Paper text:
Furin1 belongs to the family of the calcium-dependent proprotein convertases (PCs). The classical PCs cleave after basic residue motifs, with furin preferentially recognising the motif R-X-K/R-R↓ (where “↓” represents the scissile peptide bond). Besides the subtilisin-like catalytic domain, all PCs require the so-called proprotein convertase domain (P-domain, for some family members also called Homo B domain) for catalytic activity. To unravel the binding epitope and the mode-of-action of the furin-inhibiting nanobody Nb14 we solved its structure in isolation as well as in complex with the target protease.
To investigate the effect of furin binding on the structure of the antibody, we also solved the structure of Nb14 in its free state. Also here, no significant structural alteration could be found as also indicated by the low Cα-r.m.s.d. of 0.20 Å.
Numbering used by the authors: 1 to 117
């Protein structure tokens, strides 16, 4: 079946880093642009980052620009998000998805990141 599995979340103090991974299976990963989106209580769903099919073009929400980096491995069918200089406001459940607004199975079940003093 179509599966997207996020991992790499954790609890970390502000200023710290994390790297999220998303293992894709059950479809041709290379045929899809990929997205990181995040949801946190009271803030709804907000887009974080996107990458085209081969990684030659990437985009970032304004709030994470210069701090986060999206990348993909089309051999391993894996999506990544390296996060630096984490803030409180980055606390959220992070999902990877084939679209900004995709729903399961085309969005994963998420990985929690909690940035707390
Ligand atoms: Cl909410």
């Amino acid at each position: 079946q179509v599966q997207l599995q996020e991992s790499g979340g954790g609890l970390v103090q502000p200023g710290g880093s994390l790297t999220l991974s998303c293992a894709a299976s059950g479809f041709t990963f290379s045929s899809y642009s990929m997205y990181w989106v995040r949801q946190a209580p009271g803030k709804g769903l907000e887009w974080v980052s996107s990458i085209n099919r081969v990684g030659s073009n990437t985009d970032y929400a304004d709030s994470v620009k210069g701090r986060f980096t999206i990348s993909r491995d089309n051999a391993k069918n894996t999506l990544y998000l390296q996060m630096n200089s984490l803030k409180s406001e980055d606390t959220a459940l992070y999902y990877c998805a084939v679209g900004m607004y995709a729903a399961p199975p085309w969005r994963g079940q998420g990985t929690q990141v909690t940035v707390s003093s």
